[PDB]
Amino acid sequence: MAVKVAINGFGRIGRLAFRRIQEVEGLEVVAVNDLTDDDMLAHLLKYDTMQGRFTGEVEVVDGGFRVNGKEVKSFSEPDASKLPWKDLNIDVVLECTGFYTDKDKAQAHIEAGAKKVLISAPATGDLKTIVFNTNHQELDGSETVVSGASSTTNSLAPVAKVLNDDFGLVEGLMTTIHAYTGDQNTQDAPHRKGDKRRARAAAENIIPNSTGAAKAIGKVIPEIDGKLDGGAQRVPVATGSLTELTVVLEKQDVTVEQVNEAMKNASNESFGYTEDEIVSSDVVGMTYGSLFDATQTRVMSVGDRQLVKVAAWYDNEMSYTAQLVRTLAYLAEL
Amino acid sequence: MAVKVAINGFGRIGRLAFRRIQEVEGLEVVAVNDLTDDDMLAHLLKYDTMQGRFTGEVEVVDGGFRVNGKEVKSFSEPDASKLPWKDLNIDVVLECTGFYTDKDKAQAHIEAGAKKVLISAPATGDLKTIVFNTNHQELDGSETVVSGASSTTNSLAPVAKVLNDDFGLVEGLMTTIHAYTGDQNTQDAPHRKGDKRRARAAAENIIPNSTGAAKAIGKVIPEIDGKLDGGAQRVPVATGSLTELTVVLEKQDVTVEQVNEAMKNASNESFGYTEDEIVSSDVVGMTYGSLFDATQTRVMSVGDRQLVKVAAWYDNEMSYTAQLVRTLAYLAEL
Amino acid sequence: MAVKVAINGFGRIGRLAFRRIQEVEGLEVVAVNDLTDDDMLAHLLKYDTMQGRFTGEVEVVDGGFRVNGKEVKSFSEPDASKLPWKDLNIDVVLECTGFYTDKDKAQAHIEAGAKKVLISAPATGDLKTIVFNTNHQELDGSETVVSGASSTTNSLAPVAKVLNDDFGLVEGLMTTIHAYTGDQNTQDAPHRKGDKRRARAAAENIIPNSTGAAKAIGKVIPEIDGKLDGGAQRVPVATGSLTELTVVLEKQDVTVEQVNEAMKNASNESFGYTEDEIVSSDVVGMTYGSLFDATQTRVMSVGDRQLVKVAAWYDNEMSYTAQLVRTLAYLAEL
Amino acid sequence: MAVKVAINGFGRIGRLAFRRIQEVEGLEVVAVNDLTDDDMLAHLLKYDTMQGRFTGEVEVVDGGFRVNGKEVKSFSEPDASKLPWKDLNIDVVLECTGFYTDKDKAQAHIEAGAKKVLISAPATGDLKTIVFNTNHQELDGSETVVSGASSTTNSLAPVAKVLNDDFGLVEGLMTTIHAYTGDQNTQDAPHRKGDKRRARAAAENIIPNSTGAAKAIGKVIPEIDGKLDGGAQRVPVATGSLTELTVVLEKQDVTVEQVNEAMKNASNESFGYTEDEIVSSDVVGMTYGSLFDATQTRVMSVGDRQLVKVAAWYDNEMSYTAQLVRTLAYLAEL
Ligand SMILES: NC(=O)c1ccc[n+]([C@@H]2O[C@H](COP(=O)([O-])OP(=O)(O)OC[C@H]3O[C@@H](n4cnc5c(N)ncnc54)[C@H](O)[C@@H]3O)[C@@H](O)[C@H]2O)c1
Ligand SMILES: NC(=O)c1ccc[n+]([C@@H]2O[C@H](COP(=O)([O-])OP(=O)(O)OC[C@H]3O[C@@H](n4cnc5c(N)ncnc54)[C@H](O)[C@@H]3O)[C@@H](O)[C@H]2O)c1
Ligand SMILES: NC(=O)c1ccc[n+]([C@@H]2O[C@H](COP(=O)([O-])OP(=O)(O)OC[C@H]3O[C@@H](n4cnc5c(N)ncnc54)[C@H](O)[C@@H]3O)[C@@H](O)[C@H]2O)c1
Ligand SMILES: NC(=O)c1ccc[n+]([C@@H]2O[C@H](COP(=O)([O-])OP(=O)(O)OC[C@H]3O[C@@H](n4cnc5c(N)ncnc54)[C@H](O)[C@@H]3O)[C@@H](O)[C@H]2O)c1
Hints:
The structure is a homotetramer. By secondary structure, chain A is of the alpha/beta class. Chain A has helices at residues 12-21, 38-46, 85-88, 103-112, 151-167, 256-264, 318-332; strands spanning 3-8, 27-33, 58-60, 64-67, 70-75, 92-95, 116-119, 128-129, 145-147, 169-179, 207-210, 228-235, 241-249, 271-274, 290-293, 298-302, 305-314.
């Protein structure tokens, strides 16, 4: 009575998805794939700088590793098509490598014998893109390859839904103050992608960087396609981020208290609500996809012209991971 | 015949002001006041974590200390009215303690015998708030107490002025992503002003915080009074900051190129312009009050309806200090 | 039913000791004192940059704050001698302010009505300095004022005791690579105790500093009095530290293996043992006083002459606090 | 007649060497090779997070880039034997990739037409390891491939030389508290060489790591072959490092003053001396290979048995680069 999951890419997302899946009955990681030995894998599962020590027991054994009395088969294969997914009976591949972010590229897992693929990032192609608790009812089981969207898109989507539904979204800009990630360099150095900002010492700088999140929000919410854009600022915290959205609305005479009350009313397991004066380190490890922060809501009015600004915290690691694993369980049921 | 300056608070701004004044002909620092002794004062002047070693000879003498063959007397007197300003024929106090940011309170320096005071911060009371090269001309010689505004206000004013003069400023919101400062706690601990966010480990968090830069811009540019608002996020870089501004403009079919060009045309020694993809560490020690970054200009257009975003860097330490010492020499000569 | 505890100084060690007491039956914190209000105290209890969110619920109430249904009384009285310790029937004060670290200073609490005082630091005067599971046995219940030693002494003593007992300590030198603490400055600035290195930006430097842990070890282990000395390097992690000790011994032809086994054989709840290649963030929140790392044992031999190096991790915050609370329970039950 | 230098690997050491060479007449960098494009090489030369802005002007041109009016040719070739060193009359290659750290591999540069190769690290094979002003006089002219030693070795050699000549070195152990480097990971992730410690987030951790600097000291000072060993602790400063050495000496009754005078007596342009209480950010950019800090000197005596401890600072970046360049000029001169 268990969905067989494979994780491809035992990185920040793959390993935390593993932690998360240890709490979900009939979701079972049976295999992992990465570019390293089992020793490295076990070690990175047990010890995690920002996320804390793994909550149980990990042992390096023959096939891969032993976790809480259950065998996880391990692989070191960089080509997905060469994976023994048929032999292992893989129900869902959690695609967390970063190198398969596309319907066609990700098809490789289907070939290998897996039935479904959920990608842990935006992907290109004829795919559904899903934010759990905003978007997931759009799934139905016809789907073969699915995208779980991005960390920022999951912090942003439910905020933007309330704004448009209650106020009419005219247009908006976003800046996310985002923790630095592994694709940024440790020291100033050539960047494999040619990006002169990601090339810079990650933990020593405020770094402007591109994001597709707001420009691509149409994918999870069609009613506001092309109404939002924005960028990121990468700063020196290792995880935990903040999304800031500035919008023009159709409804006039909107107040700070109307905005906060309408977000609080939309709150759920995915969309948290707070009025405490928290900081980034306080959301590290949290499982809400987006935590709306009422202390940061601002309204600028001049005559009949208004600018409305809001902000929501997210552990770009764990908040995204928890949303990804919610979508996985729902996807798997269908 | 040289202007005689006393620096109250030999802190980050006060010691960098000391460095600047060594470049300005006919300004001399004859005295310094703080809460410590000469061993500490000299040492902090010689070694500076973010701004580099001070170049000349610094020796502790009987007066206080000697810098490059020049005597600076020093005192350790928390009560400014007891300072010997009359005896030393002080022309201007640079008030950099953070404890006299008020016209009435700053009057303690005038009672002690200084002719004028220039405060290194926003200040309450019946006084002028001055951004060099935006409104320093508003000074006419009859001022005894003057505020040199804030780092953020200095980064924001020339940008906001061009937006209004060239496009018609309807309204706008600001975020400044600001390096952490000395009023933040090293570790989570009770905060002296009761701020629950400045209570937190400065170097381990993105911390939201208030700033009056946009709200009180009318003091510097009266014609856009009440048109801007916004706040700050304090992040773990030790100096160097970015101001992001989102606005609606009367001019209707705005392009990135029009905005970038209007800014370049306003550049001078206070207001720089760059087209390079820089990060915060690149502005450390710069002497522009504000460096416009043309790579971060965006125009979001939905039908006839546009939002415009711009960003300008500032070394909140050295950019602010270079501006303060310019306003200082100008005020002295009046 | 429970020993009634008051915490003087609700700082890092105060708050963590509060959290730790929640989990030790027979101990109850009935009051807290600091220099702040209840809004701030409840906030710092609930939220913690490195140590994570408080598990229970916390609420400001009229005399203080309620934690998990229990009322804690709070006060903000800088002079210990005025605290209503008599009417609260306080059994022990945990003295965690940093301002009463001497026997006669701490006596103020006794005069205010506490039965006993345990100071969260080295302390001067006629008192016992106690590291739990190395020498707490020297307490006989009759003590009025006791020192819980330092984080570094607690990391060091069990290690030094094994080296001496099993190999005969001749002499040795220590360096502790130690997380930065609240008594360092956020930015370069005058330091209160005139210390020119603690003056420096804590999160941006390696900073040599003094410590007495090794030189005063004799207070904890009399038989090696005078044999150890050494220092600290403060570095940019917010908590988590490592004690390295290089010794000369009486035993000859000593091997890495004999040293590791001796250390494992002495392991208990205060002295941990590991062979995992962990790093500082891995010890954040651990409740061992000292965590011996067998991967860092080195022996240098030249002919008949050897130097033996070892290293033991500690969370200078939580390791020390768990040692404190054990000594507290022991002192109270006598 | 100016020496013609090609730099292989335009990274931290290669870029800094390029900058340092602009300060040294007789030496001309004519070519640069790496794995990126001209836009990125030029940008990373112009901007540098820790070492500050390049003083020169830099322009991308058809062959490469122009620096102050002189053309530097640039190549994008991973196989060094395919490089056009004979066409360009390369006198010395500065091999700074990390990928040719071997006599036989480095020979690819000579095959390709360069007269000599100087490797920016320790190297395998039958070649000499040079720390300038300690053993550079061992270069007799016949050499074609040479090692510039490591940053730690350059910090340690002049210190160990004095201890041995003046006091007779019996044995010693070393710990270097070292800035994180580019081969450590930004976030916890699998590591290229299977190192479970360089795997972990560089800027969030104290990370033990192995160094060959002490153990291989004998290649630089043969008289002390085998008498030193030790390791490293990598910490969250982006550059700037400290070497502590703990030693047994033949000379008895050694004092702090004798050790300090003896080090002051050996100072030169490679080996600096200070009595100021500095921290790591104060050495960033310094051109001494080793800066002895007299404030950190300690002598432990127990009867007739002493341990002596010293510490020397180095900018692992610029201290080593300035040494490498001195060795370059010397090696070129014969
Ligand atoms: N904040 C975040 O870290 C964040 C949030 C949401 C989504 N994501 C997305 O999740 C994906 C993974 O992100 P991450 O943060 O874990 O990065 P990461 O580098 O930690 O993880 C990538 C892992 O995949 C492995 N890998 C790389 N190529 C492989 C291959 N071809 N076959 C098998 N394994 C391979 C690597 O060894 C590495 O461990 C990315 O697409 C990223 O954009 C990241
Ligand atoms: N990014 C920035 O640091 C920045 C930018 C612009 C303006 N400012 C403003 O300038 C002022 C100083 O800021 P800072 O960053 O230099 O802080 P700081 O703490 O480094 O400097 C304060 C100095 O004043 C001394 N001092 C405090 N009270 C005193 C008193 N009563 N009498 C004499 N000396 C006293 C302190 O010992 C300290 O050296 C503040 O008002 C701040 O708002 C700071
Ligand atoms: N690594 C560590 O942080 C650590 C480890 C072991 C021991 N210690 C020791 O424990 C003590 C506290 O350390 P900390 O890191 O928690 O410091 P901290 O600054 O976080 O806490 C000190 C607290 O005492 C307060 N205070 C309360 N009442 C006071 C009063 N009555 N008079 C004066 N000050 C008062 C301050 O407001 C503050 O909250 C110090 O002795 C320190 O050396 C600290
Ligand atoms: N503190 C230090 O950074 C330090 C000090 C002294 C010595 N070193 C040594 O110097 C060397 C370089 O270290 P770094 O810190 O500058 O590293 P780095 O990563 O910044 O630089 C290496 C550069 O070489 C390039 N490269 C890699 N392979 C190449 C190839 N085959 N052909 C051409 N270019 C290639 C990379 O793109 C990169 O720009 C290493 O041996 C290192 O151990 C480092």
